[PDB]
């Protein structure tokens, strides 16, 4: 069977989340690394993943939680198969959900081969 990278499925879960939240009113601001240096990418990916969970929690929605759960399962998988002096997540700029998810796609493109 064809091996398809987990990050592809991560990208389409992000798109799914974008569509699902359009009907809702999530107004959280989230730590967002808009320009990830390659040298800190795993640190940054971990922040994105943590902050996606806030979107999930605040949603109170089954489909969103299920999509988020599937996304982070997929991500942790890939990340299984040391960066020093990277910013903590709380050092990042906070942005709205739309910019957050756009930047999440951007980092995911870095992990695709």
């Amino acid at each position: 069977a064809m091996a398809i990278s987990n990050w592809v499925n991560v990208i389409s879960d992000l798109k799914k989340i974008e569509d699902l939240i359009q009907s809702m009113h999530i107004d959280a601001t989230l730590y967002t690394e808009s320009d990830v240096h390659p040298s800190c990418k795993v640190t940054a990916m971990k922040c994105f993943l943590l902050e996606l969970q806030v979107i999930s929690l605040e949603s109170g929605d089954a489909s969103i939680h299920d999509t988020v759960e599937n996304l982070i399962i997929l991500a942790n998988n890939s990340l299984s198969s040391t960066e020093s002096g990277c910013k903590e997540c709380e050092e990042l700029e906070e942005k709205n959900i739309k910019e957050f998810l756009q930047s999440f796609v951007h980092i995911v493109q870095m992990f695709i081969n």
Partner: protein
């Protein structure tokens, strides 16, 4: 016509409530020198104990941590 009481305190955070009305959504904000822990939520909501007709604010998962920006200059 149900409304919520003053919200409970969250360590290192404060809150100003725009509406005490049922299902109102509000947010705790970490004090100066503290930051919301990534992956924790500041949202609280006024919800109903169904078989009590009494409303309360949900506990947020928020955790306020020392600002990492500062933790390095002392």
């Amino acid at each position: 016509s149900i409304t919520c009481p003053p919200p409970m305190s969250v360590e290192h955070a404060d809150i100003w409530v725009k509406s005490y009305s049922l299902y109102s959504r509000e947010r705790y904000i970490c004090n100066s020198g503290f930051k919301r822990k990534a992956g924790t939520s500041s949202l609280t909501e006024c919800v109903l104990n169904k078989a009590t007709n009494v409303a309360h604010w949900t506990t947020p998962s928020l955790k306020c941590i020392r600002d990492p920006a500062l933790v390095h200059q002392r």
